[PDB]
């Protein structure tokens, strides 16, 4: 579907002026707050009015004023516009001529970097649009077709702005440069001589080699960190795979937030009754991400991890904080055993570090003492109320514990990670072990893509990274460990 119903560079006033000229009653638009810098504002017009309703995330959802919880924004609007009530009415999506979050967008990049980037991370059907330094307000579409052989080029097409519509000279001319790209995407310009102009991918400007990171770091840090970030966030429109089970009437009490679900395709499923909010992560380490246990959850969590085989579960909230429950106690007081439904709990030992406790607890089906195995429970302590770490080494040398446990398990099954929704604190964990993963074993010469394996987890559980300061320090988190080896 589309996300143009975000507009990443809009005021409050400027949204108020979209929605009271271009809109009607029931339009809608969202964008970020000015006011709360992090959050986000869901602009509506009834009654010729416009409504402005907060929605705040500080890491784990994004909470709408007056309303649910959510995992995406995309996920939010999908949600009201399928009534599934706020009474105010999410009718008309106002949608967004800004390019400054397509992939295929890259501002003011001059010809001569665009022909390098293009040449060295190019490949057959790559493209790029950016600002024309010759014509102030015109645009260049370049695009890869086919390094020594001249078997390969690069064409590049001049958009004209006139009147506040786009043209590549000729033909139609369009509102914006997404609708431009999207016609030629699917009718492609064809040259004098044959040669397709396929628009078949953007150009890969995200994939670095790892020892670069210091460097992309720094170029992020003067901003092209929101807009890379924002560019990813309008992706997850693609993400809206179903989650009926989870909608089930009696699913819906196994659900910490009631509109935040495993999707249907990568939910776990239990045998031997079969639901749990939980989703496998395959990226070779393979995760099940996971909510806080609620009082009715905790024998279904056990069921999950036997089932699975998994032997290390990583827990990344206190039970309580800000005086909030986020996961109920579901191990046993150290020394003591506890049965959980068919499934009987040892907690052997506790050994206490400073960013966390570690519990060696054995798991087996009652009935069948053969059954017995140790699971780890590696639970983080430290993460801090607001926010992300200032610094990642705690985080790092946690994650280092972690991957040397489950290496140690011969036949161990999927790492379980949980924090309170599963889908922040637990995405900014797996999506680091997964990029350190990479340069452990393929070395400081590996490619890593931070927004490309950050989709690839969220298409596996909705709104895995909730953040922008996630998204940095995952980013900070595998700077550090590069600059450790
Ligand atoms: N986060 C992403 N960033 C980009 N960049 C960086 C940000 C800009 C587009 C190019 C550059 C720019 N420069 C100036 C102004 C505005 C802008 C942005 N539009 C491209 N794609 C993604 S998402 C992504 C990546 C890799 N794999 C998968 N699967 C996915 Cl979904």
């Known amino acids: ?23 009607v009653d029931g339009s809608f638009l969202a964008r970020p707050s000015k006011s709360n810098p992090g959050d986000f504002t869901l602009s509506v017009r009834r009654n010729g ?58 501002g003011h990049l001059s010809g001569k970097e665009a022909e390098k980037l293009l040449t060295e991370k190019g490949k057959h059907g790559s493209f790029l649009v950016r600002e024309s330094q010759s014509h102030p307000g015109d645009f260049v579409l370049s695009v890869r077709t086919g390094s020594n052989d001249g078997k390969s080029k690069v064409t590049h097409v001049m958009i004209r702005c006139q009147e506040l519509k786009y043209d590549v000279g000729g033909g139609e001319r369009f509102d914006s440069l997404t609708d431009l790209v999207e016609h030629y995407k699917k009718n492609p310009m064809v040259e004098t001589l044959g040669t397709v102009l396929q628009l078949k991918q ?97 024998n279904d969590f056990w069921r999950m991890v036997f089932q699975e085989n998994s032997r290390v579960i990583v827990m990344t909230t206190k039970e309580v904080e800000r005086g909030k429950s986020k996961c109920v106690k579901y191990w046993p007081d150290e020394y003591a055993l506890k049965e959980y439904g068919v499934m009987r709990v040892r907690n ?55 991957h040397h446990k489950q290496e140690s398990i011969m036949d161990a099954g999927p790492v379980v990670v949980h924090c309170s929704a599963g889908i922040g604190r637990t995405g900014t964990f797996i999506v680091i072990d997964i990029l350190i993963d990479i340069i452990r074993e393929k070395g400081v010469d590996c490619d890593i893509d931070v927004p490309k394996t950050i989709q690839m987890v969220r298409s596996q559980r909705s709104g895995m990274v909730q953040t922008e300061a996630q998204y940095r320090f995952i980013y900070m988190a595998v700077q550090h460990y590069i600059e450790t080896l």
Not at 220 to 231: C, D, I, N, V
Request: glycine content about 6%.
């Open 1 to 23: 579907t589309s996300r143009r119903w975000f507009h990443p560079n809009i005021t409050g006033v400027e949204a108020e002026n979209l929605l009271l000229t271009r809109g």
């Open 49 to 106: 009015a416009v409504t402005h309703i907060k929605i705040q995330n500080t890491g784990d959802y994004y909470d709408l004023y007056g309303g649910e919880k959510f995992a995406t924004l995309a996920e939010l609007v999908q949600y009201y516009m399928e009534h599934h009530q706020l009474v105010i009415e999410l009718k008309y999506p106002l949608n967004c001529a800004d390019p400054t979050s397509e992939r295929w967008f890259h």
């Open 202 to 298: 953007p150009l890969n400007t995200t994939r670095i080699n790892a020892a670069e990171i210091e460097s992309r770091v720094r170029e992020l840090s003067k901003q092209g960190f929101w807009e890379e970030f924002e560019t990813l966030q309008q992706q997850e429109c693609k993400l809206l795979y179903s989650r009926k089970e989870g909608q089930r009437q009696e699913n819906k009490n196994k659900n910490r937030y009631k509109n935040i679900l495993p999707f249907d395709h990568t939910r776990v499923v239990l045998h031997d009754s079969d639901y749990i909010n939980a989703n496998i992560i395959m990226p070779k380490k393979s995760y099940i991400a996971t909510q806080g246990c609620l009082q009715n959850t905790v």
């Open 348 to 402: 052997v030992k506790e050994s206490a570090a400073h960013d966390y406790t570690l519990r060696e607890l054995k798991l087996s089906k009652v009935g069948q003492g053969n059954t017995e195995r140790t699971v780890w429970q590696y639970h983080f302590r430290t993460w801090p109320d607001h926010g992300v770490p200032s610094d990642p080494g705690g985080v790092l040398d946690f994650l280092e514990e972690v």
